[PDB]
Amino acid sequence: MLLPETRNLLDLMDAATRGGRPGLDTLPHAVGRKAVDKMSEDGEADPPEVAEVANGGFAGPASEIRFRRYRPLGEAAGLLPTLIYYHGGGFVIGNIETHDSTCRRLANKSRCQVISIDYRLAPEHPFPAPIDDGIAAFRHIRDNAESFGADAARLAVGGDSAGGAMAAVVCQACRDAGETGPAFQMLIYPATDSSRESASRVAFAEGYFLSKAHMDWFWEAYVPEDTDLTDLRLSPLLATDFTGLPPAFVLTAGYDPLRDEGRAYADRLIEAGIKTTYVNYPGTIHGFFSLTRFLSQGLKANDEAAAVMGAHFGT
Amino acid sequence: MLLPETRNLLDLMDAATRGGRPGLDTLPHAVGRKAVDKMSEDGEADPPEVAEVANGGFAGPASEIRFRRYRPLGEAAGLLPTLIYYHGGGFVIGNIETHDSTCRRLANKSRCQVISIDYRLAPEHPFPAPIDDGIAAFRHIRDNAESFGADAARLAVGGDSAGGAMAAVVCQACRDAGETGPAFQMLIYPATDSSRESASRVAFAEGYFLSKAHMDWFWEAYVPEDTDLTDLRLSPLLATDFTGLPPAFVLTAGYDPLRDEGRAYADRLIEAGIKTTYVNYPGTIHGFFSLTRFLSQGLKANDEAAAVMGAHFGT
Ligand SMILES: *[P@](=O)(CCCCCC)OCCCC
Ligand SMILES: *[P@](=O)(CCCCCC)OCCCC
C-alpha cells in the first residue's frame, strides 16, 4: 500500500544511510540539531509569496518567545481569524525556518493569519518547558488579540508531531483552568500517549522515516528520569473528560507509529459530542506534511487542513 | 443537548403538526410530492450567483435523463474537475430545484463544475429504476467528458440521503464491473443498510425530522415486496470487499437515524486502506445540508464538503 512517490524518497534515504551519512543518532543533540534542521529546510517545497511577514518576540514564563506572522494574499481586513502553529521535532529539533514554506501555504489556502511560535527546546530546557511556552503563547495572543491583528472570536491552535501534541494540551489546559480556550484545534499526526505502545508503534518501529531509535533519542533529552508517564501533558489521550474541548481536525498517516493513538484521540472527541474531522492518508509516512519537495500528498494535506479550518471560520 | 437553531426549527414543525391539519405520512405519494417539493425549495437559502447555468438532457436506460450544470465564478478553464450530484428524497420526492441553491454554493466554494442529475422517481418507477439512471448518468458523463466540459481525470459523484446511497452504489457497481469508476465520492448522511436497525435508527425513530413513519411510507413505494434486503443496491454496507473504491468524504448528523450506518460505512473504508474523511456535526438533524434557510450549520457543512473535494483535485 506504499505510494510510488513515498517509496521513491525511502530509496534516497536508504542510499544516503549506507553511503557516508552516519545517521549515527549523535547525542550531541546540539550538534545533530544543526545538521538535521538544514535537511528539514531543504525538504520543504519552495516558499509561496504572502502579503506580509513579520518577526517579533515577547516575554514568556522564563524567556523571550520569538514568533513570525504570515498575512495571506488579498486579505484586506485588519483583524483576521488566526492559527497559532507549533513546529514539530520531538521537543528537541526544528524552528520557524524548518516549517516556513508550510505556514505560508497554510495561510494563503485557509485565508487566515498564521503565527508560528519558537518555543524552548530540549535538552537545554526539558519537560515541561516546551508546552509551558506553548500555553503562554496562546494566552498572550488571546489577551492581546488586536495587537497581533487577530479576531479573538476565531482563534485556533495546531501543529505536527510534538507540535500537534502541544496543540491538544493547550486546549485541555484551558478547559481544566476554566478559562476561554481556542475555537479550533488542528492536530497533524500528533503524539497523544506516552503511557503504552499501540499496534502501529510496534508495526512501524523500523524502516519508515521516524524510527523507534529516533523516538528514544528524543525521549532521553525531553523527559527527566522518573516522570509519571500518565501525566496528561505527556499523554492527553488518558483524560477522563473530553467534553468542552473545541472542534478538531485530526490527520493520520498510514505508515506512522503515531497512527493508532492519533485516531484514538479523534474517536474520544466524536463520542464526547465534539464537532470533529478525521482523515487518514494511507501509503505515506510520518513527516510528509512538510517534506513537500518530495511528496505531493503533503501539499494536498496542507491544502485540505487549511480548507477545513477556513470553512469553519467562514473565510 | 441540541443546538438552539436546531431546537428552534423542531418546535415550528411541531406547531403545524397539531396547530394545523398536516400529515405527509397520510397522503397519496403523487399528491404529497407536489406540496413537500415546494417546501423544500423554500427551505434552501437564497441562491448565490454563478458564472453560468446550463440545462440539458440525454438518453438513459428507459427515458430521457434531465440535468443542470453550474460553472463556478472566475473559473476560466475549459475542462474543469466535476462533481455529479444526486438529490435526496427517499427515491420518491425532490428534483433539481429542491437542491439548486446548494449545488450553486458547492461549485463556487469547491471551484469545481457541478452536474445535478434528475433521476426516475417512485412509485411511478420503483426499484431498481432510480439507481440505474444514477449509474447511466455517470457512465455517460465519463465517456463524453469533454462534451460536458469536464476533466475525465478528476470526475466525482455525491449526494444526500437516498442520493448519498445512490452515490456509494455507483462506485461499487463500477468496481464490480471492472471499469473506470469515479475519482472521489462525497457521501452526505447517506442510508447504507436496509437489512437491520442500528441503535440510532431506534433512538431517533420519532420526533427529530426524519421519522420511522416517513421511512416506511417511502419504503412501500420504492421497494417491491419480497426483495432480499441484503441486496447491495439497498445495503452497500454489507459488501465483502471495500478495496479499490475511490477516496471518500463522509458526513453524519448527531440526531439522525442514519447516523450509525453512516460512520460504519466510513470505518469500512478506512480499514480497507482508502483515503477517507469522516465528520460528525453533533446537535443538528438529518436534512440540515439543504435546510440552509433555517440552519447555519448546513452552510458550514456545504463549505466544508466543497473544500475537501477542492483540495483533493487541487483547485
Ligand atoms: P528508521 O526506521 C531506523 C530503524 C533502525 C532502528 C535501530 C534498531 O529509519 C528509516 C530510514 C529509511 C530507510
Ligand atoms: P417524526 O420524527 C415524529 C412526529 C412528531 C412527534 C414528536 C415526538 O417527525 C418529526 C417532525 C418534527 C416534530
Residue of minimum CA distance from atom 1 in ligand 2: B211
Residues of chain B neighbouring A307 (CB-CB closer than 8 A): 307-308, 310-311
One-letter-per-residue 3-state SS of chain A? CCCHHHHHHHHHHHHHHCCCCCCCCCCCHHHHHHHHHHHHHHHCCCCCCCCEEEEEEEECCCCEEEEEEEECCCCCCCCEEEEEEECCCCCCCCCHHHHHHHHHHHHHHHCCEEEEEECCCCCCCCCCHHHHHHHHHHHHHHHCCCCCCEEEEEEEEEEECHHHHHHHHHHHHHHHCCCCCCCEEEEECCCCCCCCCCHHHHHCCCCCCCCHHHHHHHHHHHCCCCCCCCCCCCCHHHCCCCCCCCCEEEEEEEECCCCHHHHHHHHHHHHCCCCEEEEEEEEEECCCCCCCCCCHHHHHHHHHHHHHHHHHHCC
Phi and psi at B253, nearest 5°, equal -115, 150
Q: Which residues are registered as beta bridge partners of A229? A: none
3-state SS assignment for residue B281: strand
Do A303 and B311 meet the contact criterion of CB atoms below 8 Å apart?
yes
Q: How many CA atoms lie within 13 A of B305 on its CB side?
A: 34
B263's grid cell:
460512520
CB B53 within 8 A of CB B302: no
Which residues in chain A have Cβ-Cβ distances shorter than 8 Å to B270?
280
B111 reaches A (C-beta below 8 A)? no
**d(Cα B270, Cα A244) in Å, to the nearest integer?**
27
- Answer yes or no: do B303 and A283 touch at CB < 8 A: no
Is the Cβ–Cβ distance between A162 and A89 less than 8 Å?
A: yes
Alpha-carbon dihedral angle through residues B201, B204, B207, B213, given to the nearest 10 degrees: 10
- From the list A147, A114, A143, the residue with the least C-alpha distance to A315 is A114
Q: DSSP 3-state helix, strand, coil percentages of chain B (rounded to 5)?
A: 40, 20, 40
For residue B127 the three cell numbers come to: 426499484
Residue A3 Cα to ligand 1 middle (Å): 19
Binary contact (A308, B308; C-beta < 8 A) = yes
Neighbours of B115 (CB within 10 A): 24
> How far is it between the farthest Cα atoms of chain B?
55
| Residue B126 DSSP SS3 | coil
CB A108 within 8 A of CB A74: no
Q: Does A306 touch chain B (CB under 8 A)?
A: yes
- Is the Cα torsion angle B25, B288, B224, B229 positive or negative in sign? negative
Residue A302's contacts (CB-CB under 8 Å, 6 or more residues apart) are: A102, A105, A106, A109, A289, A292
Report the relative pairing of strands A113-118 and A64-71 from DSSP bridges.
antiparallel
Q: Are A265 and A17 in contact (CB under 8 A)?
A: no
SS3 label, residue B254: strand
3-state secondary structure of B289: coil
Give residue B301 CA to ligand 2 midpoint distance, Å: 24
Ligand 1 in reach of A56 Cβ (< 6 A)? no
Task: Please give the distance of CA B251 from its chain centroid, rounded to a whole number.
Answer: 11
Residues with CB under 6 A from ligand 2: B 10, 13-14, 17, 206-209, 211
**How long is chain A?**
315
| Experimentally determined by | X-ray
What's the CA-to-centroid distance between A301 and ligand 1, angstroms?
25
> Residue B160 and residue B116: Cα distance in Å, rounded?
12
Which residues fall within 8 angstroms of residue B303, CB to CB, at 6 or more apart? A310, A311, A314, B105, B109
Cα–Cα–Cα angle for B157, B68, B83, nearest 5°?
A: 20
Q: How far apart are CA A118 and CA A154, in angstroms?
A: 22
Active site residues of B: 161, 256, 286
Which of chain A's residues have a Cβ under 8 Å away from the Cβ of B304?
277, 308, 311-312
Task: Give the C-alpha separation, B74 to B117, whole Å.
Answer: 24
Calculate how far, in angstroms, residue B195's C-alpha sits from the geometric centre of ligand 2: 24
Phi, psi of B210 (to 5 degrees): -35, 125
Burial class of residue A159 in the structure, from the number of CB atoms within 10 Å of its CB (0-12 exposed, 13-18 middle, 19+ buried) = buried
Q: Report the run of H or E that residue B11 belongs to, with start and end.
A: helix B4-19
How far apart are alpha carbons B150 and B181 in whole angstroms?
15
Tell me the C-alpha to C-alpha distance, in Å, between residue B106 and each of B65, B85, B88, B99, B301. Answer: 22, 10, 16, 11, 10
Query: Using CA atoms, how far apart are residues A150 and B304, in angstroms rounded to an integer?
Result: 22
Q: Decide if B81 contacts B70 (C-beta within 8 A).
A: no
Tell me whether strands B185-188 and B248-255 are parallel, antiparallel or unpaired.
Answer: parallel
Please name every residue paired with A117 in a beta bridge, in sequence order, or none if there are none.
A67, A86
Cα A148 to Cα A141: distance, rounded to the nearest angstrom: 7
Cis peptide before B128 (omega within 30 of 0): yes
B5 burial via Cβ count (<10 Å: 0-12, 13-18, 19+): middle
- How many CB atoms within 10 Å of residue A126? 17
What's the farthest any 2 CA atoms get from each other in chain A?
Answer: 54
* Closest ligand (CA of B201): 2
Q: What is the DSSP letter of B236?
A: G
- Residue B313 is classified by DSSP as H
Closest approach of B125 to chain A, Cα-based (Å): 38
Question: First and final CA of chain A: distance in angstroms?
Answer: 36
- Residue appearing with cell numbers 482508502: B274
CB B116 within 8 Å of CB B96: yes
B257 to B5, B62, B158, B268, B285: CA distances (angstroms): 19, 33, 20, 19, 9
DSSP classification of residue B206: S
Instruction: List the one residue out of A34, A161, A11, A179 whose CA is nearest residue A85.
Output: A161
CB of B156 closer than 8 Å to CB of B82: yes
Peptide bond connecting B236 to the previous residue in cis, omega within 30 degrees of 0: no
Q: Using the structure block, give the residue that is written with the C-alpha cell 488586536.
A: A146
Residues B180 and B156: their CA atoms lie apart, in Å, by: 12
Task: Please name the amino acid found at residue B14.
Answer: D
CB under 8 Å to A14, separation ≥6 — which residues? Answer: none
Cis peptide before B126 (omega within 30 of 0): no
Using DSSP, state whether B153 is helix, strand or coil. strand
Q: ∠ CA(A232), CA(A237), CA(A241), 5° rounding? A: 85
Domain chopping of chain A, boundaries: 1-315
Q: How far is CA A21 from CA A14, A26, A30, A239, in A?
A: 10, 12, 18, 42
On whether any CB of chain A is under 8 Å from the CB of B109, the answer is yes
Q: How far apart are the C-alpha atoms of B115 and B103, rounded to whole Å?
A: 8
Q: What is the CATH number of domain A1-315?
A: 3.40.50.1820
B11 CB-near residues (< 8 Å, 6+ apart): none
User: Which residue's CA lies nearest to atom 6 of ligand 2?
Assistant: B207
